Design a protein around this ligand. Sequence first.
Ligand SMILES: CC(C)N(c1ccc(Oc2ccccc2)cc1C(=O)O)C(=O)[C@H]1CC[C@H](C)CC1
Ligand SMILES: [Mg+2]
Length: 559
Amino acid sequence: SMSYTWTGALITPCAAEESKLPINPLSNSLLRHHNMVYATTSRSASLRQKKVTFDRLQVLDDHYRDVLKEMKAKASTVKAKLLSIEEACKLTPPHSAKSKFGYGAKDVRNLSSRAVNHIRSVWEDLLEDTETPIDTTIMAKSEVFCVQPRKPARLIVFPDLGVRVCEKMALYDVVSTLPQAVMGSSYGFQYSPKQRVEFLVNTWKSKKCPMGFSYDTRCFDSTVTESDIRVEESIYQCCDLAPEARQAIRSLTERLYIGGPLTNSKGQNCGYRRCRASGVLTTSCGNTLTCYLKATAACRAAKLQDCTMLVNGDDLVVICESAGTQEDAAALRAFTEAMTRYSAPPGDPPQPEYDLELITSCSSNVSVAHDASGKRVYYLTRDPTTPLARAAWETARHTPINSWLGNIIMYAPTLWARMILMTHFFSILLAQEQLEKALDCQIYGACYSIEPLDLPQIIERLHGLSAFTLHSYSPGEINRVASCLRKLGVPPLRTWRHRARSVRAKLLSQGGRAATCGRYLFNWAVRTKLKLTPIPAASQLDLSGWFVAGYSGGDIYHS
Ligand SMILES: CC(C)N(c1ccc(Oc2ccccc2)cc1C(=O)O)C(=O)[C@H]1CC[C@H](C)CC1
Ligand SMILES: [Mg+2]
């Protein structure tokens, strides 16, 4: 069937949409070519709609069924709990889209009589009505990028706040613990960036002759079929579940996840969906399970040998035992055909990679640098173009989510996050006298509130003290960063070094936590290095819930 059907009504915005970067005195010091920076708007929605709309092809074989049963057996060990309204509400982000039933984010978290009473009625309804298609709103997502030698906005389909709270009640526990139980070490969201690298590097070394590749599925969400979603429900159903939760999953599956009507911001019937919705609680879990299933089965059809998968939603990377250049290329092609039959055709054709640093998964790649002692140290990085374009935009305008803070946390050891983002933002935060202020950001889709002053500890716990001393990066990483700077018009190292030394001095004079950031974060900038000993606060940090599972589109907030 058709991934989508359209009525003609347009996907409309719900206010004014900024497309260009504001000429700002502060954004200009970070990036000079402001015209290369842009944000998607509903004005490009038509272009997107045509790309995600198509008839899906699907043929299932014995390999698929086999892997499916393997997966179900493991799911069979699971015991999901079911959250009470109270907890599900606690999980709602303070700034999440309001409900059309008289209440909003704040009321939900505050457990207002009106919000809880409505939520209750939606839950009862999910228990009584097993059919009626649940209404969703479709919107053009606004995201920032740098022009290329432009991207049309992405679309998001999400149900009402009321319905979202119920999804949590019935599936929060499931989507937080079933992926790991079913896929084990292949589930990428259980790893912190450093743990992801270690898993990738060790996996790579465990091969006599390693061969690896990333697989890009062309619009993965639209390739998800009604069948894949029921197969996915079948996996969830192997769990021990409270009666009400079992019915909630059954009804939410037929009424929401397999598809339903599309309404715009004006309240107009836009069309219908018969593929994955991007703004539902099961999206990450669902996509990860389905990609792993098709991929694993695809590997068997292709005869790839000793495959180790690493899956994060629709993002996939496979590392296996080489069989030779020609044989690897043939196997890879066979893999792609198997995936195509399973309704997961490629966007970018896949290519075998014999160099670990050249494999990009989760928009990132593993690379290597050196610590003070001089020992090689592997770490996660990525092309900084987008991270930087967005740092510029968030500098010029107020945004709910600060990706820059999220990028500093996840890529702390990188040459670009240290030299550019830390310097730029600590300089700016000192000025505005807002170093104490907590900011929201996302990690694997879950929303968190973090104090910039804590970055030193956070970085030590997740990356180790070496994140403050890495130097001598790879020639490949250096060219990528440098050619990035030229493109966006970012000041060179010298300028940044001067700024960092000036910010570092200012941070050291304040003492307390600010001096902590001064000493650690900017030690790369001075010549007279300061001995960097373990930060006490790093040994008393609970950062486990940070890397448990994916939540993108889940409307998840970790208090
Ligand atoms: C060796 C030495 C001088 N050096 C480098 C300076 C420039 C560079 O590569 C470029 C080139 C152009 C633009 C940006 C970086 C790479 C390195 C390195 O450590 O290998 C450093 O000490 C870095 C160490 C990390 C900080 C955070 C910035 C300076
Ligand atoms: Mg893709």
